[PDB]
């Protein structure tokens, strides 16, 4: 007589009291975020402590209920989400150790600093450092700063990260999952039945196929970028080699947009600039919001409730309480919607406001489902919904048709090319990097490669896929990949790729209904209702259904594809086909320090036999010291100069145990290419068996 209605009643029970408490917690958080005061910290603490206490008590009382007896998928999803133990199966000491090490890593990342030998009393933090990286135009200084930051941050992050990954893998193994990689992979499909055969492991080959398909366009773009880059820095780029890592204009290389200034086809044609009209009209902060509301209502979706316009944060507080301008779409529930942002008069502000309003209007549509299901189907839809509208609104034709941008502008067959190139330098540039980083993190996690091969694997990979070569050889003690942000905060880093694909997937699918004629980049979401009906049908589902069902609802396909993406870039592909029609590709061998080093052949230990020994480190020590002494005496021999060469002036590289070395020497304080081959060759020839 129990069946599963006991679950039904228990569900109703937490439904009664979850919403209100969530409301007070969220309003306390907003109150802090608006006004910064000490008492607000105590308020949030006394709210969140009891909020988490309610989480823990309800979880511990909900654990005993069985799962295999559940038949209805709707309640089964909620029960499976709820009936989770996770880290609770871990003993306290290691849990607190994990928390402490995570906090230590965050703190050590937050307080970096790199200082030059020339003026050791002046130097920067990450902010001014990034500013210099963005503005500077000197090869030497940029290489220097990148190397300095990487060395300083890496040297203090090896053992901590090693222990972190060890403990995480142990936790994942103890949580019934094969590896932490599985645990992250235990999401983002986690379903499929009666029409859907797919499981967790299939994602690997899905992304592999997608990247393989997308490769050629990126290869062509890379060819063009390499061809153009040699203008700025001659005698540094091999015609068939890769590119220096530090020359990608950004700290890491996640975005290439900053290179646009250098790859502009020509400066003869000015771009679109209509800031004058709004600046002279001086639109109020509310005018843009009202216009955006009119635009969105033009497609049929319901407009926001009047109560929203009262409780809001449209303008600058103009009060002593300092606030941050990072746009946010606070969804408090119970039809309490608020937007936090400071408003100015710029196109970027316009598109950001449109994005935030898209966020909030998507959130509104599904308010009546439940509490636990108040979420997106995956990690990509929520941002995709805003991104599609943001892409649509920027089209010049609509801007001309809505009142701004008068008809005194005749577009040509090159301006759209410039717009497409600008979009491509960001939409596609980050895909190889994201793929490479995610793959490397996975394989490190499950333990396929031992710890000692981390850095030797990393640079090989960067040579293979992305097409970037290290500026200077790096030994094993470094921990380059930890210098990033998302690496040091244990944030899942797969959403970006799938989000970028689904964006254009939805764009093409929806534009299909509009019955456009020309290239997809000219599509519009102007007056229409069937498109709005389809969009509402998509959004209202929420988390109650598998996402593949949603794609079938619009995309009518059970999987993703790059065909819409390449179709959207077809004019760009044809334009680029006429510029690099002779050569394209790379070789994973060449490098800047390739024509400068010396072979330094190695004699076999067994050939010597007597008085022979394996390195066990500590011996290239002697080689470096001896060659440094030889160089010091060499300069005194005829050059009559007093350069105090040091021990760490010899660069080990490309070692195979007892099989080979390679090295070259650099000046104490101007390490770019100095001390060419001939000088060191003469110096080493001069000396005698005092070395070997």
């Amino acid at each position: 007589y129990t069946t599963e209605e006991e679950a039904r009643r228990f569900l109703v029970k937490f439904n009664h009291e979850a919403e209100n408490l969530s409301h007070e917690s969220a309003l306390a958080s907003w109150d802090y975020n608006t006004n910064i005061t000490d008492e607000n910290a105590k308020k949030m603490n006394e709210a969140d402590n009891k909020w988490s206490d309610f989480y823990k008590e309800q979880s511990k009382i909900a654990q005993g209920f069985p799962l295999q007896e559940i038949k209805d998928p709707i309640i089964k999803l909620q029960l499976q989400i709820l009936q989770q133990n996770g880290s609770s199966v871990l003993t306290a000491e290691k849990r607190k150790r994990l928390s402490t090490i995570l906090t230590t890593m965050s703190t050590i990342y937050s307080t970096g600093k790199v200082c030059n030998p020339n003026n050791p009393q002046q130097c920067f933090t990450l902010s001014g450092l990034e500013d210099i990286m963005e503005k500077s135009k000197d090869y030497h200084e940029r290489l220097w700063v990148w190397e300095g930051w990487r060395s300083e941050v890496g040297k203090q992050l090896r053992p901590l990260y090693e222990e972190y990954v060890e403990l995480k893998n142990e936790m994942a193994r103890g949580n019934n999952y094969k590896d932490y990689g599985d645990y992250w992979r235990g999401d983002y499909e986690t379903e499929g039945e009666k029409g859907y055969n797919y499981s967790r492991n299939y994602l690997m080959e899905d992304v592999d196929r997608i990247f393989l398909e997308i490769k050629p366009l990126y290869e062509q773009l890379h060819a063009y970028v390499r061809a153009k880059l040699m203008k700025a820095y001659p005698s540094h780029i091999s015609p068939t080699g890769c590119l220096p890592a530090h020359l990608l204009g950004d700290m890491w290389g996640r975005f290439w947009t900053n290179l646009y200034n250098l790859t502009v086809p020509l400066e003869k044609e000015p771009n679109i600039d209509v800031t004058d009209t709004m600046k002279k009209q001086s639109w109020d902060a509310e005018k843009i919001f009202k216009e955006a509301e009119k635009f969105y209502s033009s497609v049929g979706l319901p407009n926001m409730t009047p109560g929203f316009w009262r409780d809001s944060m449209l303008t600058e507080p103009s009060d002593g309480r300092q606030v941050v301008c990072h746009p946010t779409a606070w969804d408090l529930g119970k039809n309490d919607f608020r937007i936090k942002m400071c408003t100015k008069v710029t196109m970027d502000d316009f598109l950001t406001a449109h994005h935030e309003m898209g966020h909030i209007q998507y959130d509104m549509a599904y308010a009546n489902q439940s509490y636990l299901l108040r979420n997106g189907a995956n990690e990509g839809f929520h941002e995709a919904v805003g991104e599609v509208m943001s892409l649509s609104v920027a089209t010049p034709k609509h801007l001309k048709g809505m009142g701004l941008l008068p008809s005194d502008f005749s577009e040509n067959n090159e301006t759209e090319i410039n717009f497409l190139l600008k979009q491509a330098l960001t939409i596609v540039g980050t895909l190889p990097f994201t793929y490479m980083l995610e793959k490397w993190r996975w394989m490190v996690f499950e333990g396929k490669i031992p710890k000692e091969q981390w850095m030797e694997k990393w640079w090989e990979m960067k040579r293979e896929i992305v097409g970037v070569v290290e500026p200077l050889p790096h030994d094993e003690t470094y921990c380059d990949p930890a210098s990033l942000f998302h690496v040091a905060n244990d944030y899942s880093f797969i959403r970006y790729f799938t989000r970028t694909i689904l964006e254009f997937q939805f764009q093409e699918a929806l534009c299909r209904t509009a019955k456009h004629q020309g290239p997809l980049h000219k599509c519009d979401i102007s007056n229409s209702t069937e498109a709005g009906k389809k969009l509402n049908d998509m959004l209202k589902l929420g988390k109650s259904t598998p996402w593949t069902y949603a794609l079938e609802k619009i995309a009518e396909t059970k999987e993703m594809d790059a065909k819409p993406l390449l179709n959207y870039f077809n004019p760009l592909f044809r334009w680029l086909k006429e510029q690099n029609g002779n050569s394209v590709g790379w070789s994973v061998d060449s490098s800047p320090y390739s024509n400068q080093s010396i072979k330094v052949r190695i004699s076999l230990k067994s050939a010597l036999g007597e008085k022979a020994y394996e390195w066990n480190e500590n011996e290239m020590y002697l080689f470096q010291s001896s060659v440094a002494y030889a160089m010091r005496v060499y300069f005194l021999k005829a050059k009559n100069e007093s350069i105090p060469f040091r021990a760490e002036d010899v660069r080990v590289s490309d070692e195979k145990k007892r099989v080979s070395f390679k090295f070259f020497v650099t000046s104490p304080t101007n390490m770019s290419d100095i001390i060419p081959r001939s000088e060191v060759e003469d110096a080493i020839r001069m000396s005698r068996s005092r070395i070997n």
Binding site: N303, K334, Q369, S370
Partner: protein, 196 residues
């Protein structure tokens, strides 16, 4: 007898609350109607107010509701906001007239209410979801019941049995404003309100 609504000027208007009043064979003057209040704005459903000065027919429908100036923009039915399905129904019937008013201070009998209050979510809770009820013509917010308890805080909410209610409280500043609805019923009969 005369079709007069003299005792209307008594005090606080209905906040979700509603009333219905009807008259009999009578005679009503246009001069007093004009003197009721100055011209702020009136919108009639394609019926000239002047033409209404003649003809004794079934009945009128006079009601005054607390409101505000700007929200009159959203008064016009062009969206599914909570005002129509989750608050006082915007009942549509035989052509009617809507009037916005800002009462002067000299009518001291009127009493200014503490704060405005319009419902946001009243619904019959269920297992899977919320199961929203939607207002219908001739219903007047069927939720009612525990809503009589009152509202004291922002987004104040309370539930009884399996009905849950929550509303919004709008503090009042300066002079208040009033909204008048005059819905008409045609046909001459005993209930008919006659002019003069």
């Amino acid at each position: 007898q005369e079709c007069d609504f003299t005792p209307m000027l008594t005090g606080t208007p209905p906040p979700y609350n509603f009333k219905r009043l009807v008259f009999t064979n009578c005679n009503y003057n246009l001069t007093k109607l004009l003197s009721l209040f100055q011209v702020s704005e009136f919108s009639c459903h394609q019926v000239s107010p002047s033409s209404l000065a003649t003809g004794c027919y079934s009945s009128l429908t006079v009601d005054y509701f607390a409101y505000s100036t700007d929200m009159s923009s959203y008064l016009q039915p062009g969206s599914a906001g909570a005002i129509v399905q989750f608050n006082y129904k915007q009942d549509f019937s035989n052509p009617t007239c809507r009037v916005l008013a800002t009462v002067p201070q000299n009518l001291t009998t009127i009493t200014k209410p503490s704060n405005y209050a319009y419902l946001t979510e009243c619904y019959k809770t269920s297992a899977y979801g919320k199961n929203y009820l939607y207002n219908a013509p001739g219903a007047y917010t069927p939720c009612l019941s525990l809503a009589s308890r009152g509202f004291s805080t922002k987004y104040q909410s309370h539930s009884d049995g399996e009905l849950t209610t929550t509303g919004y409280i709008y503090p009042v500043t300066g002079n208040l404003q009033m909204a008048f609805i005059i819905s008409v019923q045609y046909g001459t009969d005993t209930n008919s309100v006659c002019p003069m």
